[PDB]
């Protein structure tokens, strides 16, 4: 942010949003497994490994919803190879 810092700051553009949702996704996801430790979680981490199939995959979308507010896809956990991606899908779903 330059010049229009204030705006940017109190504007949180897509960037911040994407980077924002991401952080959330990470936790949100990890939260599914049953832990609140993102440190042990990356953005390029495969959900599968995280431990997602259906139940956990469901909880995600559910929580993810709170990240967006729409009826996110249930196959996201599948269409999404990693969190980094999840962010996009959400972003694309938001815009």
From Swiss-Prot:
Q: Which residues carry this modification: O-(pantetheine 4'-phosphoryl)serine?
A: 54
Lineage top rank: taxon: Bacteria
Q: Where is the Carrier domain?
A: 16-94
State how it assembles: Homodimer. Erythronolide synthase is composed of EryAI, EryAII and EryAIII multimodular (2 modules) polypeptides each coding for a functional synthase subunit which participates in 2 of the six FAS-like elongation steps required for formation of the polyketide. Module 1, 2, 3, 4, 5, and 6 participating in biosynthesis steps 1, 2, 3, 4, 5, and 6, respectively.
Other observations noted: Type I modular polyketide synthases (PKSs) catalyze the step-wise condensation of simple carboxylic acid derivatives. Organizationally, type I PKSs are arranged into modules, wherein each module is comprised of a set of catalytic activities that is responsible for a single elongation of the polyketide chain and the appropriate reductive processing of the beta-keto functionality. A minimal elongation module contains an acyl transferase (AT) domain, an acyl-carrier protein (ACP) domain, and a ketosynthase (KS) domain.
Role this protein plays: Involved in the biosynthesis of antibiotic erythromycin via the biosynthesis of its aglycone precursor, 6-deoxyerythronolide B (6-dEB).
This chain's protein is named: Erythronolide synthase EryA1
Q: Please give the organism.
A: Saccharopolyspora erythraea
> What is the primary gene name for this protein?
eryA
Q: Which residues of the full protein are shown?
A: 3318 to 3408 of 3491
């Amino acid at each position: 942010g330059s010049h229009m810092l204030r705006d940017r700051l109190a504007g949180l553009p897509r960037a911040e949003r994407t980077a924002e949702l991401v952080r959330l996704v990470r936790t949100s996801t990890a939260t599914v497994l049953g832990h609140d430790d993102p440190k042990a979680v990356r953005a390029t981490t495969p959900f599968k490994e995280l431990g997602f199939d259906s139940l956990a995959a469901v909880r995600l979308r559910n929580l993810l919803n709170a990240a967006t507010g729409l009826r996110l896809p249930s196959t996201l956990v599948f269409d999404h190879p990693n969190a980094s991606a999840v962010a996009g899908f959400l972003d694309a779903e938001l815009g």
